[PDB]
C-alpha cells in the first residue's frame, strides 16, 4: 500500500472517499472535511513524507508543485480576492495528520496573526 | 514595481538576516507574531504566488526547504507554521512572494 496508512494515504488510494479537485502523478487536491473558510482545501503529495521537518533536499520540486497546484486550484475555484496557504509542522504547528499537506483557505478575509 | 523586500535583498536597508544563498534570503520579520517569526523570500521578483510560473516550482520548494532548515537552526524543535498570503483576502502585506515561518508558541486554529 503506497502512501502509507494515514487518512491521507488511504484517500490517495481511493480507500476512503474525498471530494477531489485535482489529481496528477505527484499530488492530490481535495476539500477539507472541517473547513475553516468558505473554501478550504488540501494539496498533498502522493509520496509519503511525514512532516516538512523531515523532507529531503530532493523533495524541493514536489513541495513547490504543491504550491503551484494550490494556486491553480484556487483560481479554478474562483478565489479571485486571494487566499492563504498554510503548512502545520509538529505540535506547535497544530499538525494532526503526519503526511505532508498544504492548506489553501479563501472566500473570506483572513486575519493576522495566522493563528 | 520595487518593494521594501527588494531593498532588503539589495542590502539598501537593514534586516536581521538568518540565511542567504544565490536565489533566496531569510530574515526575521520586523513585526513578529510569534517568539520566532522569519521570512524566506526568492531573489527573483515574483509579485505573488498566483502569478508564479511552472518553471518556478523548484524555487518555491527551495523556500520551504530553506525555511525548515532555518527553523531547525533557530531551535524550533516543537514545530512551527509556514504561511504564504495571496491578495487582499489572504492579507498579503508586500507584493513580493514570501514564506512566513512562525513558532516558539502554540499556533492556533483557524490560521486567521
Ligand atoms: N477531506 C478530509 N477527509 C478526512 O478524512 C480528514 N481528516 C482530517 N482532515 C483535515 O486535515 C487537517 C488535519 S489537521 P493538520 O495536520 O493540517 O494541522 C484538518 O484540517 C482536517 O479537517 C480531513 N479532510
Ligand atoms: Cl503577507
Swiss-Prot record, chain A:
Its main location: cytoplasm. The modification N6-acetyllysine is found at residues 10, 19. It is found in: Cytoplasm; Nucleus. The active site is at 101 (tele-amp-histidine intermediate). Its EC number is 3.9.1.-, 3.4.22.-. The keyword Membrane does not apply. A motif (Histidine triad motif) lies at residues 99-103. GO terms for biological process: intrinsic apoptotic signaling pathway by p53 class mediator; positive regulation of calcium-mediated signaling; protein desumoylation; proteolysis; purine ribonucleotide catabolic process; regulation of DNA-templated transcription; signal transduction. One of its GO terms (molecular function) is deSUMOylase activity. The keyword Transferase does not apply. GO terms for cellular component: cytoplasm; cytoskeleton; cytosol; extracellular exosome; histone deacetylase complex; nucleoplasm; nucleus; plasma membrane. Keywords: Acetylation, Apoptosis, Cytoplasm, Disease variant, Hydrolase, Neuropathy, Nucleotide-binding, Nucleus, Phosphoprotein, Protease, Thiol protease, Transcription, Transcription regulation, Ubl conjugation pathway. Changing residue 40 to R: In NMAN; no mutant protein is detected due to post-translational degradation; no effect on SUMO-specific isopeptidase activity. Changing residue 33 to W: Approximately 30-fold increased affinity for tryptamine adenosine phosphoramidate. Changing residue 27 to R: No effect on SUMO-specific isopeptidase activity. The modification Phosphoserine is found at residues 34, 61. Pfam families: HIT (PF01230). It is an enzyme of class 3 (hydrolase). It is linked to Neuromyotonia and axonal neuropathy, autosomal recessive: An autosomal recessive neurologic disorder characterized by onset in the first or second decade of a peripheral axonal neuropathy predominantly affecting motor more than sensory nerves. The axonal neuropathy is reminiscent of Charcot-Marie-Tooth disease type 2 and distal hereditary motor neuropathy. Individuals with NMAN also have delayed muscle relaxation and action myotonia associated with neuromyotonic discharges on needle EMG resulting from hyperexcitability of the peripheral nerves. Homodimer. Interacts with CDK7. Interacts with RUVBL1 and RUVBL2 and is associated with the LEF1/TCF1-CTNNB1 complex and with a KAT5 histone acetyltransferase complex. Identified in a complex with MITF and CTNNB1. Interacts with CDC34 and RBX1, and is part of a SCF (SKP2-CUL1-F-box protein) E3 ubiquitin-protein ligase complex. Interacts with SUMO1, SUMO2 and RGS17. Interacts with the Ten-1 ICD form of TENM1. Interacts with CALM1; interaction increases in the presence of calcium ions. Exhibits adenosine 5'-monophosphoramidase activity, hydrolyzing purine nucleotide phosphoramidates with a single phosphate group such as adenosine 5'monophosphoramidate (AMP-NH2) to yield AMP and NH2. Hydrolyzes adenosine 5'monophosphomorpholidate (AMP-morpholidate) and guanosine 5'monophosphomorpholidate (GMP-morpholidate). Hydrolyzes lysyl-AMP (AMP-N-epsilon-(N-alpha-acetyl lysine methyl ester)) generated by lysine tRNA ligase, as well as Met-AMP, His-AMP and Asp-AMP, lysyl-GMP (GMP-N-epsilon-(N-alpha-acetyl lysine methyl ester)) and AMP-N-alanine methyl ester. This is Adenosine 5'-monophosphoramidase HINT1. It comes from Homo sapiens (Human). The lineage of its organism: Eukaryota, Metazoa, Chordata, Craniata, Vertebrata.
Amino acid at each position: 500500500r503506497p502512501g502509507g496508512d494515514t487518512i491521507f494515504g488511504k484517500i490517495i488510494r481511493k480507500e476512503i472517499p474525498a471530494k477531489i479537485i485535482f489529481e496528477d502523478d505527484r499530488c492530490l487536491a481535495f476539500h477539507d472535511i472541517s473547513p475553516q473558510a468558505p473554501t478550504h482545501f488540501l494539496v498533498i503529495p502522493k509520496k509519503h513524507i511525514s512532516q516538512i521537518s523531515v523532507a529531503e533536499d530532493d523533495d524541493e520540486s514536489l513541495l513547490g508543485h504543491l504550491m503551484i497546484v494550490g494556486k491553480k486550484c484556487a483560481a479554478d475555484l474562483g478565489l479571485n480576492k486571494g487566499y492563504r496557504m498554510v503548512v502545520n509542522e509538529g505540535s506547535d504547528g497544530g499538525q494532526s495528520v503526519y503526511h505532508v499537506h498544504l492548506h489553501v483557505l479563501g472566500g473570506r478575509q483572513m486575519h493576522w496573526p495566522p493563528g
